[PDB]
From a paper:
The type IV pilus is a diverse molecular machine capable of conferring a variety of functions and is produced by a wide range of bacterial species. The T4P is a filamentous polymer made of type IV pilins, the individual protein monomer (PilA), that is polymerized by several chaperones and minor pilins to form fibers that can extend micrometres in length with an outer diameter of ∼5–8 nm. The general architecture of the type IV pilin protein is an extended N-terminal α-helix connected by an α–β loop to a four- to seven-stranded β-sheet, termed the head domain, which packs onto one half of the α-helix. The C-terminal globular head domain faces the exterior of the assembled pilus, and in P. aeruginosa pilin proteins it features a conserved disulfide-bonded loop region that is responsible for cellular and surface adhesion termed the D-region.
Here, the 1.3 Å resolution crystal structure of the N-terminally truncated type IV pilin from P. aeruginosa strain P1 (ΔP1) is reported, the first structure of its phylogenetically linked group (group I) to be discussed in the literature. The α–β loop immediately follows the amphipathic α1-C helix, and the receptor-binding D-region with the conserved disulfide bond to the last strand of the β-meander is present. In the final model, all residues except the N-terminal side chain (Ile25) were observed, and 216 water molecules and a cacodylic acid molecule could be modeled in the electron density. The cacodylic acid also makes hydrogen bonds which stabilize the α–β loop and the α1-C helix as its O atoms hydrogen-bond to the side chain of Thr73 (2.46 Å) and water 17 (2.94 Å, B factor of 20.59 Å2), which connects to the helix through a hydrogen bond to the side chain of Glu39 (2.75 Å). The conserved disulfide bond is formed by Cys127 in the fourth β-sheet and Cys145; however, Cys127 is observed to have electron density representative of an unbonded cysteine (∼20% occupancy), which is likely to be due to radiation-induced breakage of the disulfide bond. Asn91 and Lys92 have particularly high B factors for this region (17.5 and 18.9 Å2, respectively), which is especially interesting as the residue which differs between P1 and 1244 is Lys92 (Gln in 1244), indicating that this flexible region may be of importance in the specificity and recognition of P. aeruginosa group Ia pili. Regarding the positioning of the monomers, there are clashes that occur between the α–β loop residues Pro63–Thr66 of one monomer and the D-loop residues Pro138–Ala141 of the other monomer; these regions are not pronounced in ΔK122.
Author numbering: 25 to 148
The structure:
Amino acid sequence: ISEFARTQVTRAVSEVSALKTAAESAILEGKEIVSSATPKDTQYDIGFTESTLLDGSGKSQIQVTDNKDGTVELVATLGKSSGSAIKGAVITVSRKNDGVWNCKITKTPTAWKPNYAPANCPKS
């Protein structure tokens, strides 16, 4: 892979962020949000495919926290084809109960550089 590290981080943020639509649909339907190949009963799977930039396999690349209170976290870790200077960093795309979302990056590796974070998902 020849993409820039910052392009990889941004793509990953976009891949997680693309799932907000589905999370909003689950919330309107009164269903628990999941990312699973085996959603149980009333659970609503958010339709994620797979990324070349995230650790884990398929739907398990996105870790969902659904507190059932209008807040949501969609969490992924940079891995696989990601450059060594970003691997292990965690993207968290979070919803407040007013329906406003935000993004942050945490747990970055030593070799992280400021310019790798996009303006829409700052390092915390």
